[PDB]
Design a protein. Structure first.
Lengths: 77, 130, 162, 55, 124, 24, 147, 51
């Protein structure tokens, strides 16, 4: 249902969103390089996230990534 | 307004919670009162209906787009009435269609004989640009 | 600071919503005749200038609401009722409870304002490319400014109690 | 020949079944009405609970 | 158009900007030590250098799967310099020159992604 | 479009983080 | 674990709407109910989405009527005939009960369902969406349908 | 939620499995109802000659 060019774009966007969330949570909630990968993985698979970002600049990444995985999964189904 | 009558539901956390509820992803916070829980449940029902309807409409769009058939044979062109087919005004094609005793071509001839728009073109280049 | 940003907002939201429902320049359809709320004034309709009233005549409950536009008006009635509630901060002061009565009307008008559009769009459609004029976008500002005035009126009530 | 062949409409051309209309608010307003009604009911029950707790 | 390499060049612009702040915060830490607690100035430097080297490792990995080997050559010598520091783990004048070049290199290559991305999007 | 929205959100979040870091 | 009459309702509502539940049942006899309700709501939402996708994909519009003996019982669509002709004379002297009921309905009907010419009849048919029906000859009916 | 690293790998792979299964089940059930609704019984002689 999804072209091979999209699957390669999802993985790098998943890691790209994860590394940005770690950088946002660094200038200032732990949200390390490990917890950010877990939160982004729990958000992409429509599962319940363990924790939510506290800062506004971290909440923007969460809400935007939530809209991303919603459109992608709805388009895949 | 509801969850602040006089908790952790300010004006910044309420937007975050409602955004997480609309995306069906959930948050760590939840309404503690009764009317707040009513608001949350109504918003959950609304966003669930919206997401299900959007997914269904996208699936229907994709299925309708994939189930298409271009006009290839003359039998498909005779049955399909959305595209009007015409020939030269005075040529061998019109004379052949006027004397074609075939059910596939007879219906086409009767369709091209009565038509409000121009179904006969004098110059072949005019028909090409048309 | 916030005590003055509410009275100026009530007169900037009621006086701005009453204009959006007054001028009939909400929808632009096709001759190109601009539409409105209670009556549409035609243009390029075989006449230079013509402006006639629309005739709308269990689905009958939606037609009367579209004709008798009460929801886009009820929001303006609540904006003036809440605009005088915050005006009661000087006279009969030290009450610490009349400000909460304004935070309810400031948001109850926003619920009746978004509804006034749902009954207007569902009845509009019920090819022809139609757009929304500048007069229709004014009503949208009557809902955004109705929520900022609904968060600034209740926040003062919380600070007064604390 | 004289009744069905000399017809003005065709069943194949009429049954296009392509380019379905995008969903509009004409049939989705049923959920927005319920959302607004639930918000109003929640505000009302919150006000009633506050009035009961004050008394 | 829309290619996988065009999307890789878009994520770099958002990520390379974060690498700019690291080399800028580096010259500020070296400027404070030049004027003159000393542990907080160097321990924080050890905490900031690790993400800067790991983020650049993605730049050499994203373009590897994007078939854009013309850009990879502009980032391989940068990754080779990280191997020298990772292997061995006055000095003020040497490290100062070793940091001003980072700000210039992370900026000149930053304008490449701002232009090489346009060379693929509008070129449909 | 969703990829553009993702990139724009990441850029806006980086800008907001810069602003909040320079606020102190 | 409290799980009162309120918290249980909240948890069930959060589980039905695919949202993240606040708490999970501690005992096994509560975890069983939780998992069963999760499976139930998953199946229900999947079936609802599948049916809504099947609806917008293909349409099957059926006629509101199928015969004359069916419209004589619903009496929701006002059907009309010719003023003076074969149809009126046939419906006048009818011994069968169905056509007799049709005639006694068409007699006392406001407004007048009778039409002078067939052109006005087909015009009223094309005008009225689903509240009119004309009773003409099968040949002329097929000819008008094919026009 | 799994706190360790390899424990998170188990949850991540299981999450990918249940996502594909549920999405495939919903997509297949939609195809069943659509094909069943898009049926046409033989009515005319032209339909019987073709079928
Ligand atoms: O002997 C004949 N030789 C023809 C040769 C050609 C071609 F070679 F293809 F140009 C064409 N065309 C094909 C399509 O329309 C434009 C020109 C028609 C011919 N006709 C029919 P006419 O031109 O109506 O007399 C003849 O009778
Ligand atoms: O009295 C009024 N209240 C209003 C609230 C919102 C809008 C609106 C805007 Cl601001 C932009 C785009 C679409 C809009 O209306 C929608 F229904 F969403 F299509 C118009 C309004 N008019
Ligand atoms: C979260 C709970 C939502 C409940 C919604 C109830 C809606 C009832 C609508 C009844 C319509 C009846 C039509 C005949
Ligand atoms: C059939 C047409 C009915 C029109 C009713 C209009 C009612 C307007 C009420 C305005 C109240 C202003 C105070
Ligand atoms: C978008 C980036 C803006 C950067 C602004 C930097 C301002 C620095 C002010 C203090 C400089 C001190 C130099 C010793
Ligand atoms: C939770 C992460 C799951 C990752 C699954 C990766 C599967 C890769 C399959 C590659 C197939 C290549 C076929 C040409
Ligand atoms: C603070 C975050 C507000 C929400 C921003 C992202 C919303 C989802 C994407 C919307 C794109 C139009
Ligand atoms: C309906 C009769 C009164 C019309 C008044 C029109 C006023 C237009 C003001 C425009 C301000 C931008
Ligand atoms: C057909 C008559 C229309 C009259 C419209 C009057 C609108 C008054 C609005 C008052 C708002 C406070
Ligand atoms: C302890 C609970 C075990 C799971 C029981 C319910 C599982 C979902 C329904 C399965 C029906 C076959
Ligand atoms: C634009 C200023 C207000 C106009 C309306 C005044 C009241 C009219 C009542 C019929
Ligand atoms: C595309 C030609 C160069 C390939 C280099 C692979 C390492
Ligand atoms: C959901 C995870 C998809 C991974 C795809 C990896 C390339 C085929
Ligand atoms: C906060 C710790 C970051 C560690 C990064 C490791 C990358 C492989
Ligand atoms: C105290 C400031 C509140 C701002 C709320 C804005 C809602 C759109
Ligand atoms: C544990 C308290 C139960 C209260 C039940 C009330 C039902 C209306
Ligand atoms: C106007 C109310 C502002 C609340 C801010 C909470 C973080
Ligand atoms: C720290 C920013 C708070 C914003 C509150 C209103 C959105």
């Amino acid at each position: 249902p999804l072209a091979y060019e999209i699957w390669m774009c999802i993985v790098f966007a998943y890691i790209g969103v994860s590394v940005v969330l770690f950088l946002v949570s660094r200038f200032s909630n732990e949200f390390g390089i490990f917890n950010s990968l877990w939160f982004s993985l729990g958000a992409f698979m429509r599962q319940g996230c363990d924790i939510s970002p506290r800062s506004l600049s971290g909440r923007i990444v969460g809400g935007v990534w939530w809209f991303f995985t919603l459109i992608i999964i709805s388009s895949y189904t | 307004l509801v969850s602040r009558f006089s908790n952790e539901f300010g004006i910044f956390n309420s937007l975050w919670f409602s955004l997480g509820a609309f995306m069906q992803q959930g948050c760590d916070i939840s309404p503690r009162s009764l009317s707040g829980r009513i608001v949350g449940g109504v918003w959950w029902f609304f966003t669930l209906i919206i997401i299900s309807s959007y997914t269904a409409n996208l699936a229907a769009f994709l299925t309708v787009e994939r189930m298409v058939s271009p006009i290839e044979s003359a039998e498909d062109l005779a049955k399909q009435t959305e595209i009007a087919y015409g020939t030269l005004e005075a040529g061998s094609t019109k004379e052949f269609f006027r004397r074609s005793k075939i059910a596939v071509f007879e219906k086409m001839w009767t369709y091209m004989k009565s038509a409000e728009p121009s179904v006969f073109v004098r110059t072949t280049e005019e028909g090409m640009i048309r | 600071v916030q005590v003055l940003l509410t009275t100026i907002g009530a007169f900037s939201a009621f006086g701005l919503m009453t204009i959006a429902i007054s001028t009939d320049y909400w929808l632009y359809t096709r001759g190109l005749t601009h539409s409105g709320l209670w009556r549409i004034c035609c243009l390029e309709g075989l006449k230079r200038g013509v402006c006639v009233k629309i005739n709308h005549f269990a689905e009958y409950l939606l037609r009367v609401v579209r004709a008798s536009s009460i929801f886009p008006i009820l929001s303006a009635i609540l904006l003036l009722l809440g605009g005088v509630c915050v005006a009661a901060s000087r006279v009969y002061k030290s009450k610490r409870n009349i400000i909460l009565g304004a935070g309810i009307l400031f948001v109850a008008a926003g619920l009746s304002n978004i509804i006034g559009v749902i009954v207007y769009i569902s009845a509009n459609a019920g090819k022809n490319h139609y757009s929304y004029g500048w007069s229709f976008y004014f009503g949208g500002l009557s809902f955004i400014l109705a929520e900022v005035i609904g968060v600034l009126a209740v926040n003062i009530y919380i600070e007064r109690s604390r | 020949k004289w009744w069905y062949d000399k017809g003005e409409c065709g069943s194949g051309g009429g049954d296009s079944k392509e380019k379905t209309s995008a969903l509009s608010l004409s049939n989705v307003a049923g959920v927005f009405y319920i959302l607004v009604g639930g918000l109003g009911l929640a505000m009302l029950v919150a006000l009633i609970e506050f009035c009961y707790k004050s008394r | 158009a829309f290619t996988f390499a065009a999307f890789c060049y878009m994520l770099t612009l958002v990520l390379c900007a974060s690498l700019i702040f690291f080399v800028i915060w580096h010259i500020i830490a070296f400027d404070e030590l030049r004027t003159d607690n000393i542990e907080r100035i160097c321990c924080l430097l050890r905490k900031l250098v690790v993400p800067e080297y790991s983020i650049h490792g993605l730049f050499c990995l994203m373009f590897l799967c994007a078939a854009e080997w013309v850009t990879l050559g502009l980032n391989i010598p940068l990754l080779f310099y990280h191997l020298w520091r990772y292997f061995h783990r006055d000095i003020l004048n040497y490290c100062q020159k070793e940091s001003w070049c980072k700000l210039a290199f992370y900026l000149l290559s930053f304008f490449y992604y701002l232009y090489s991305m346009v060379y693929t999007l509008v070129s449909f | 479009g969703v990829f553009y929205i993702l990139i724009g959100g990441l850029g806006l979040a980086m800008l907001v983080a810069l602003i909040e870091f320079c606020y102190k | 674990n409290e799980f009162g009459i309120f918290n249980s309702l909240w948890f069930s509502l959060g589980a039905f709407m695919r949202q993240g539940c606040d708490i999970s049942p501690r005992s096994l006899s509560g975890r069983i109910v939780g998992g069963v309700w999760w499976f139930f709501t998953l199946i229900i939402i999947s079936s609802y989405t599948a049916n809504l996708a099947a609806f917008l994909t293909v349409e099957r519009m059926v006629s509101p009527i199928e015969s004359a003996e069916d419209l004589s019982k619903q009496t929701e669509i006002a059907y009309g005939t010719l003023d003076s002709g074969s149809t009126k004379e046939f419906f006048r002297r009818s011994k069968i009960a169905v056509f007799d009921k049709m005639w006694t309905y068409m007699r006392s009907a406001e407004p007048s369902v009778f039409v002078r010419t067939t052109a006005e009849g087909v015009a009223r048919v094309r005008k009225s969406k689903g509240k009119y029906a004309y009773l003409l000859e099968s040949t002329m009916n097929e000819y008008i349908e094919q026009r």
